[PDB]
Structure 1
Amino acid sequence: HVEQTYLMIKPDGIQRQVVGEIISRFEKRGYRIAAMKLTIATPAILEEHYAEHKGKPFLPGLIEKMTGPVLCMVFEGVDVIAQARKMMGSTRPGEAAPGTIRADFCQQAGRNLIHGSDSAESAKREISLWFKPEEIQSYKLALSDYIFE
C-alpha cells in the first residue's frame, strides 16, 4: 500500500542549483515521481498554501521569500508522507539530524530548501492546490519487485 506526498523545492533550492541532488535523494529509495512542474509561486497561491498562518507576524516575509521559482512534485511510496518529512529533517536546520536534507544543505528555517506535506490531509490539500489532476501521472516502476516486499 503506497501513498503520495506533496514536495516542493523552494526558491533557494532552485537558485542554489541543487534541484537534481534533491530529486536524486527521493529516487534513491525507489519513490516514484508521480508529478513534477516548474512554476513561479505567487502571493495568492502562497496565501492558500500557508493558510494556517494567516495573520501571523512572520507571514509577509515568508511569502516574500517564497515568491520565486519553485519545483512542485508528487512522490509515491510506502509511508512516503512521514518518510519524506524524516528525510527533510527538522524545520530548523540547526536541529535537523545529520544525513537529512536541511542539515546537509541549510542554516535557517526561512531558507530550508524544501517543503513536504505534514499529514495525509495536508498532502491531499496541497496536491489539489498546486497541481491539476491532469498533471498526476499513473505508471509502474519496473524495479517494483525489488523495492516492495
Structure 2
Amino acid sequence: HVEQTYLMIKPDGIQRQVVGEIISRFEKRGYRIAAMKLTIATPAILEEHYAEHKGKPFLPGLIEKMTGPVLCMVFEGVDVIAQARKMMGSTRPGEAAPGTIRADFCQQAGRNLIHGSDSAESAKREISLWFKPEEIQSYKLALSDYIFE
C-alpha cells in the first residue's frame, strides 16, 4: 500500500534556486514523481488552497508571498503523506528538527520553502485543486523490488 501526497515548492524555493535539491530529497527515498507542473500561483487559486484561513488577518500577506512561481508535485510512497511532513519539519524552521528541509534551508515560517498535505483528506483536495486527474501519471519504478518489502 502506497499513497500520494501533494507537495508544492513555494516562490522562495524557486527564487533561491533549490528546486533540484528539494526533489532529490524525495527521490532519495525511492518516492515516485507521479505529477509535476510549474505554474504561477494566483490569488483565486491560493484562496481555495488556503480556504481554512479565509477571513483571518494573516491571509492577505500570505497570499501576496505565495503569488509567484510554484512547482506543483505529487509524490508516491509508503506512508508518504506523514513522511513528507516529517521531512519538511515544523512550520517554524527554528523549531524544525535538524536534517529537515525547513531546518536546513530556512529561518521563518513566512518563508519556509515548501508546502505538503497534512492528511489524506487534504492530499485528495489539494491534488484535485492543482492538477487535473489526467496529469497524474501511472508507471512503476524499476527499483521497486529493492525499495518495498
Using structure 2 for the length normalisation, give the TM-score: 1.00
Q: Within 1, Cα distance between the matches of 2:92 and 2:55?
A: 22
Deviations 1:95-137 (A, max 9, x none): 0000000000000001000000000000000000000111000
Deviations 1:10-40 (A, max 9, x none): 0000000000000000000000000000000
Q: Within 1, Cα distance between the matches of 2:142 and 2:44?
A: 39
Q: Within 1, Cα distance between the matches of 2:135 and 2:71?
A: 13
Q: Within 2, Cα distance between the matches of 1:110 and 1:42?
A: 18
Q: Within 2, Cα distance between the matches of 1:107 and 1:44?
A: 28
Deviation at 1:53, TM superposition (A): 0.2
Q: SS of the counterpart of 2:75?
A: strand
Deviations 1:18-74 (A, max 9, x none): 000000000000000000000000000000000000000100000000000000000
* Aligned residue number for residue 27 of structure 1: 27
Q: Within 1, Cα distance between the matches of 2:135 and 2:109?
A: 30
Q: SS of the counterpart of 1:21?
A: helix
Q: Within 2, Cα distance between the matches of 1:78 and 1:69?
A: 29
Runs of 4+ in 1 over 3 A off after TM superposition: none
- Any gaps of 5 or more consecutive residues in structure 1? none
Q: Within 2, Cα distance between the matches of 1:47 and 1:95?
A: 27
Q: SS of the counterpart of 1:8?
A: strand
Q: SS of the counterpart of 2:110?
A: helix
